[PDB]
PDB file of C-alpha atoms in Angstrom:
ATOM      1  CA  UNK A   1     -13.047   7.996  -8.081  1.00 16.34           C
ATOM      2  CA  UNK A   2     -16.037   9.010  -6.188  1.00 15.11           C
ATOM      3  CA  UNK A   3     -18.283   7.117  -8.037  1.00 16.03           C
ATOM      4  CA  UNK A   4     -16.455   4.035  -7.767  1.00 15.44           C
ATOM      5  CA  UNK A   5     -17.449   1.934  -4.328  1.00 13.24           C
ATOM      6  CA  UNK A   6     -14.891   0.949  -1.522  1.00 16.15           C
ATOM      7  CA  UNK A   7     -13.951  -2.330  -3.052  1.00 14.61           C
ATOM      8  CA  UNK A   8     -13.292  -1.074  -6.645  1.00 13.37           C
ATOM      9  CA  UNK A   9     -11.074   1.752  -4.891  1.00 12.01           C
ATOM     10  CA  UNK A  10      -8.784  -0.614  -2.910  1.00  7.52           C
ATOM     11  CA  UNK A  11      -8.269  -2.671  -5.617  1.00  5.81           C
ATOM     12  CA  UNK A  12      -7.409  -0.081  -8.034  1.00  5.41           C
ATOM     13  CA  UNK A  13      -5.378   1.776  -5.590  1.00  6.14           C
ATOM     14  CA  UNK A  14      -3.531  -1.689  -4.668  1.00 10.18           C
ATOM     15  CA  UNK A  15      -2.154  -1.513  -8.239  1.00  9.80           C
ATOM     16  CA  UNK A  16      -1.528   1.848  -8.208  1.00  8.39           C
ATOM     17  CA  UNK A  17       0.875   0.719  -5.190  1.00  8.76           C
ATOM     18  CA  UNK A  18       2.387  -1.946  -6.702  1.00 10.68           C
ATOM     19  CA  UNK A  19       2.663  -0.416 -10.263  1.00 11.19           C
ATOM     20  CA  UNK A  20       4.918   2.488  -8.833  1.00 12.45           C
ATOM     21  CA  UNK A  21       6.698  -0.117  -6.465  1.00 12.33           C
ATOM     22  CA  UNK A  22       7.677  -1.978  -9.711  1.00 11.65           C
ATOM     23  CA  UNK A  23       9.064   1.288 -11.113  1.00 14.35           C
ATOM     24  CA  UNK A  24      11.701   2.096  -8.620  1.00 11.17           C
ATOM     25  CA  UNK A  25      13.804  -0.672 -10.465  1.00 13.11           C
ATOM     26  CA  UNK A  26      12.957  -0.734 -13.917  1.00 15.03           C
ATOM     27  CA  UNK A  27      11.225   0.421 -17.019  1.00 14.52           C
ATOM     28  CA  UNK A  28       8.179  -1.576 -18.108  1.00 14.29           C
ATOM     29  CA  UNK A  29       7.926  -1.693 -22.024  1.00 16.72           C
ATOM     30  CA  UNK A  30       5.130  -0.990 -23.924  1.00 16.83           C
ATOM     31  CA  UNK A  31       4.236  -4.706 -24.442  1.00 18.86           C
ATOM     32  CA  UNK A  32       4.691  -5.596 -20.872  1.00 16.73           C
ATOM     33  CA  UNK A  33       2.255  -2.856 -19.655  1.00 15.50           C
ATOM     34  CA  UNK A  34      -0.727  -4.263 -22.544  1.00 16.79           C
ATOM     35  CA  UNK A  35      -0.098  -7.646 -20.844  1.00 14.25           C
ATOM     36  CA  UNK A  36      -0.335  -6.143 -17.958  1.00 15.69           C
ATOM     37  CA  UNK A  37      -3.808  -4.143 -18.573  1.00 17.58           C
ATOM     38  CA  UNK A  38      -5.449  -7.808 -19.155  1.00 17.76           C
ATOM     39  CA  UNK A  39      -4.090  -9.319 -16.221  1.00 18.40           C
ATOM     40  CA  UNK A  40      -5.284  -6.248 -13.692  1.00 18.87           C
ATOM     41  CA  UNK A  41      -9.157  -5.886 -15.892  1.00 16.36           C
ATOM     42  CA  UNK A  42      -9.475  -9.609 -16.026  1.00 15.42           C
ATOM     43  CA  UNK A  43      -9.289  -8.790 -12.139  1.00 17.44           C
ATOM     44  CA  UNK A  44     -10.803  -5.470 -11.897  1.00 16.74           C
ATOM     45  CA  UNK A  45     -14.029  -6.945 -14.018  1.00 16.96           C
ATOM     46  CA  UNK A  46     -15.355  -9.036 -10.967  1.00 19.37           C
ATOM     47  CA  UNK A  47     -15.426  -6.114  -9.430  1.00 22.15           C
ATOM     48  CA  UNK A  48     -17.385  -4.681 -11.774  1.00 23.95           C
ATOM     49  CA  UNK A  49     -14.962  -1.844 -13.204  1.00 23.08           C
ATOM     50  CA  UNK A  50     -11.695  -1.339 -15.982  1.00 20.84           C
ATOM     51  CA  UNK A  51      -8.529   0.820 -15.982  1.00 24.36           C
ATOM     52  CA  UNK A  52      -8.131   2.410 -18.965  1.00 26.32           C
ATOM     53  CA  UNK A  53      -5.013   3.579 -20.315  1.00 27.35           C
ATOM     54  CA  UNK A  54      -5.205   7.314 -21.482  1.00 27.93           C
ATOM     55  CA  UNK A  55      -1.464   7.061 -23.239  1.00 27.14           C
ATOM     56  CA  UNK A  56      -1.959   3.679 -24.830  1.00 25.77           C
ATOM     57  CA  UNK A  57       0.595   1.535 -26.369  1.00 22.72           C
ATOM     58  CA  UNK A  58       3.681   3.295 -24.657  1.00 19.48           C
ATOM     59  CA  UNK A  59       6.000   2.442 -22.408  1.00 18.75           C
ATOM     60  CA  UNK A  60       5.931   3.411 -18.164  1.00 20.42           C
ATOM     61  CA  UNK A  61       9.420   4.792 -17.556  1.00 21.01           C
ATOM     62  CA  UNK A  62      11.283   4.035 -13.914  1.00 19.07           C
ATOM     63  CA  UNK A  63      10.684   6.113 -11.323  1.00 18.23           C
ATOM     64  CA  UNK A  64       6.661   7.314 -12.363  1.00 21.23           C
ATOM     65  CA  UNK A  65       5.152   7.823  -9.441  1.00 21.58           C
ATOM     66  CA  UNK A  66       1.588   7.077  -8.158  1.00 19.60           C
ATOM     67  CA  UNK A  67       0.195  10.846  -8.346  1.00 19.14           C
ATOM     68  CA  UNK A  68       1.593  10.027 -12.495  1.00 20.13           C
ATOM     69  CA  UNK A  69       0.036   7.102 -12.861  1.00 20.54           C
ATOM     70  CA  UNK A  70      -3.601   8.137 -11.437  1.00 19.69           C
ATOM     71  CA  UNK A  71      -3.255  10.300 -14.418  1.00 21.87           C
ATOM     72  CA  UNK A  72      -2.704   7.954 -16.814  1.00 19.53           C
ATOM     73  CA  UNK A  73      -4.516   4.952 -15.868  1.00 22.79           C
ATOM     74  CA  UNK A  74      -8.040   5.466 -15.056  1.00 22.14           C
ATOM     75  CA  UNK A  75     -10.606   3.298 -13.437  1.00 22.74           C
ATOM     76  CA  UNK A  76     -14.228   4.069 -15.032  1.00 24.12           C
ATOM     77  CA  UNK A  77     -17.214   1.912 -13.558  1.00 22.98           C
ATOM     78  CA  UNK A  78     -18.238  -0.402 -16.534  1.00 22.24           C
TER      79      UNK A  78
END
Protein backbone atom coordinates (compact mmCIF):
# COMPACT_ATOMS: atom_id res chain seq x y z
CA UNK A 1 0.00 0.00 0.00
CA UNK A 2 2.70 2.50 -0.04
CA UNK A 3 2.32 3.38 -3.38
CA UNK A 4 -1.22 3.98 -3.18
CA UNK A 5 -2.08 7.87 -2.00
CA UNK A 6 -4.13 8.81 1.20
CA UNK A 7 -7.46 8.77 -0.50
CA UNK A 8 -7.11 5.35 -2.28
CA UNK A 9 -5.96 3.99 1.30
CA UNK A 10 -9.04 5.16 3.27
CA UNK A 11 -11.23 3.98 0.89
CA UNK A 12 -9.81 0.64 0.55
CA UNK A 13 -9.28 0.30 4.17
CA UNK A 14 -13.09 1.51 4.73
CA UNK A 15 -14.03 -1.78 3.01
CA UNK A 16 -11.66 -3.68 4.58
CA UNK A 17 -13.72 -2.44 7.80
CA UNK A 18 -16.88 -3.08 6.66
CA UNK A 19 -16.09 -6.38 4.78
CA UNK A 20 -14.92 -8.03 8.17
CA UNK A 21 -17.87 -6.19 10.03
CA UNK A 22 -20.21 -8.09 7.60
CA UNK A 23 -18.47 -11.35 8.55
CA UNK A 24 -19.14 -11.51 12.20
CA UNK A 25 -22.75 -12.65 11.14
CA UNK A 26 -22.59 -14.51 8.11
CA UNK A 27 -20.90 -16.19 5.24
CA UNK A 28 -20.84 -14.30 1.95
CA UNK A 29 -21.11 -16.78 -1.09
CA UNK A 30 -19.07 -16.83 -3.88
CA UNK A 31 -21.62 -14.95 -6.08
CA UNK A 32 -22.32 -12.35 -3.53
CA UNK A 33 -18.58 -11.43 -3.13
CA UNK A 34 -18.24 -11.07 -7.49
CA UNK A 35 -21.21 -8.68 -7.07
CA UNK A 36 -19.62 -7.28 -4.59
CA UNK A 37 -16.04 -6.69 -6.39
CA UNK A 38 -18.11 -4.45 -9.07
CA UNK A 39 -19.89 -2.50 -6.66
CA UNK A 40 -16.50 -1.54 -4.46
CA UNK A 41 -14.15 -1.04 -8.22
CA UNK A 42 -17.00 0.79 -9.81
CA UNK A 43 -16.13 2.96 -6.59
CA UNK A 44 -12.54 2.42 -6.15
CA UNK A 45 -12.04 3.47 -10.12
CA UNK A 46 -12.73 7.28 -9.42
CA UNK A 47 -10.19 7.00 -7.33
CA UNK A 48 -8.08 5.83 -9.69
CA UNK A 49 -7.30 2.17 -8.30
CA UNK A 50 -9.00 -1.80 -8.20
CA UNK A 51 -9.07 -4.58 -5.57
CA UNK A 52 -8.25 -7.59 -6.94
CA UNK A 53 -9.21 -10.81 -5.67
CA UNK A 54 -6.16 -13.24 -5.32
CA UNK A 55 -8.67 -16.42 -4.47
CA UNK A 56 -11.26 -15.65 -7.10
CA UNK A 57 -14.60 -17.14 -7.45
CA UNK A 58 -14.81 -18.52 -3.77
CA UNK A 59 -16.67 -17.89 -1.06
CA UNK A 60 -15.50 -15.40 2.32
CA UNK A 61 -16.35 -17.59 5.31
CA UNK A 62 -17.75 -15.79 8.79
CA UNK A 63 -15.50 -14.66 11.04
CA UNK A 64 -12.29 -13.67 8.33
CA UNK A 65 -10.77 -11.06 9.73
CA UNK A 66 -9.21 -7.84 8.29
CA UNK A 67 -5.36 -8.95 8.65
CA UNK A 68 -7.16 -12.18 6.18
CA UNK A 69 -8.67 -10.19 3.97
CA UNK A 70 -5.61 -7.66 3.21
CA UNK A 71 -4.30 -10.90 2.01
CA UNK A 72 -6.71 -11.75 -0.23
CA UNK A 73 -8.03 -8.69 -1.66
CA UNK A 74 -5.51 -6.40 -2.98
CA UNK A 75 -5.66 -2.84 -4.08
CA UNK A 76 -3.06 -2.25 -7.12
CA UNK A 77 -2.97 1.44 -8.57
CA UNK A 78 -4.50 1.06 -12.15
Amino acid sequence: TFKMNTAQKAHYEKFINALENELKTRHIPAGAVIDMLAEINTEALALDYQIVDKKPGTSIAQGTKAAALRKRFIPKKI
